[model samples]
Target: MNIFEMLRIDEGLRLKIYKDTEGYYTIGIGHLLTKSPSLNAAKSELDKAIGRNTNGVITKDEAEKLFNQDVDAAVRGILRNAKLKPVYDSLDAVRRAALINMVFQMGETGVAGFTNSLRMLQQKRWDEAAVANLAKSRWYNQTPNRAKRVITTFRTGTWDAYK
Candidate 1:
């Protein structure tokens, strides 16, 4: 595998900002924003990233770059926590990508909380896993379309719906 792929597998990737386990603002891989930056710097970066005059928003491009840097660390974390290397390896590329994306949305610990889904995944029960993926909690309500598309992909192995 190439260096970027190798690193991605080793670390992990996240394309958005989230709060870490300890409630710190994090973006990209594991970039913990302990505190907000000064207004001018924040504005400058935000402007470059999104063509905005906003003070606190990060641009899409900036977020992408941050994701590049942080994904490895995030992947490493999820892999270690999930401890399902065999299960991970058994899945086809689409299935595996779904798992990675789930782990990205919910941290490893958070993903582990979906006991039924993980169990279904371990058993290779794709349909069950897809249902379980959407059954419990705020995540589904937060992004129904995304959840639906991803879960549908899991069930039918048909992609592009989510893309």
Candidate 2:
């Protein structure tokens, strides 16, 4: 199945994955292929990762609730926590997707944490926001398969290929 579509769903193989690293097993959020050595440890890491990825926008309890909801609700809940207000102003679909993808990974506070990014955006620097959007560190460095595709969508606005 297509990774992007899978990501759009509330529950899918791409929704989550497990990792085993040195006897530690951890659950990974957002299809991130982490290293967990054991099931328990993996779940532990996943718990923290979930907290990390969500930027505490979603409490652990809320994450459990979210995973049980429908896709539309899930997407909306995530976007809400991410504070994706700027994306609404985007005239370009690709730029919108880029903001969505980044906000998903980094959370609203994370993106807003980029001192320069926030400054540029506050100044209505569209070009700067677009550039900062990609220049920030990415969460999918290990998941090259999906990372490249999403980055392409961000850079070139070619989400049709993703569809």
Candidate 3:
């Protein structure tokens, strides 16, 4: 079964923030609230689920449902972006997956901001795109080994190097 469905079966749905047996303040789909010195004393969850720990809470499984919806929307937006058109269809499954991951990491709009890298992708310039993919973003710097694996896949169109 898909992950969302699996989660639903596992974590029951709830609409309000409730304290669990563990004494953790949680809301919507099993989102746990924890202390965050950078922001506030209570941090809800990730991204869209942010600030949702106030009144409503749900199961971890239920939360995946909302997360699934978001991922779907992001994918549609990425596929529809004109900038990604050139290689979107022609890309092999691995390449397409990698590109989709890029969008997933930094929204469709954010991925679109990589004009230079997108240009390389559009031109079917694997070498250039691979280099630009690693060099142009904070993502690569943040996670060099993982980013390099993806960039390597872009360059060679295979996961053998990463393996």
Candidate 4:
């Protein structure tokens, strides 16, 4: 399932998307991955938790019901199909996973915006990779913090436990 369907959040809740007891909301998808049970679960459960944790607006099972096939395809694309071979071939597994996660979060083109990031990865320049990530246009108007943190994780091997 795509993350949105998995999480039952039709609104494109990117990173650290969560809900408090009062039903107030916080979209910190990256920040909360380490702390949330939904993210802690397998793909299906993570999807549900993504939706429900934000508020019972979506359930883990419901996310699975809606998006399992899609998620399966995505996983296959990343892990076995060599769909991203050009990019994956050069990166460490951790960096590769981080890139895939970003793509998952930001769509393929969105992730591709990281020109410098790709260059850094090509050179194995970890610091530049991190900077390249932080330099994303995504950091300008909206989703800056989330974008920055995701990039940091990619460059530094510091993913949120849940992410």
Cα lDDT over the full model 3: 0.55
Q: Pick by TM-score: which candidate is best? A: 1
Q: What does the lDDT read for residue 114 in candidate 2? A: 48
Misplaced by over 4 Å in model 1 are: 1-32, 35-62, 119-133
Model 2 accuracy (lDDT, Cα)? 0.45
The sequence of per-residue lDDT tens digits that candidate 4 reaches over residues 1-163 is: 3344323332243333365333433333222222334533333344454554433244444434444554455555655533455566666755665566666555555655664555464456466645755665544336555555555555665545224
> What's the TM-score of each model vs. the native?
0.55, 0.39, 0.51, 0.46
Model 1, 30-119: lDDT tens digits are 445555534454345445544555445555466556665555665576557546555565667666666666666665666666645644
Give per-residue CA lDDT, model 3, range 1-163, as digits (tens).
Answer: 2323322333434555555445665544344555333323333353345434433435555566666665577567767878776566667756665666566545577666764564464355465654765576787776576566555555555655434
> Stretches of candidate 2 above 4 Å error?
1-17, 20-83, 89-95, 114-133, 136-148, 160-163
Supply candidate 2's per-residue lDDT for 93: 50
- Candidate 4 residues lying further than 4 Å off, grouped into runs, are 1-58, 64-68, 75-84, 119-126, 129-136, 160-163
Output the lDDT of residue 13, model 2.
32
Give Cα distance to truth, residue 78, candidate 4, Å: 5.6
Question: Candidates sorted by TM-score, descending order?
Answer: 1, 3, 4, 2
Q: Which scores greater on lDDT, model 1 or model 2?
A: 1
All candidates: CA RMSD in angstroms? 7.8, 9.4, 8.6, 10.6
Candidate 1 backbone collisions, by pair: 11-72, 11-75, 11-76, 12-71, 12-72, 12-75, 13-71, 29-70
Candidate 3: minimum summed lDDT over ten consecutive residues — where?
Answer: 1-10
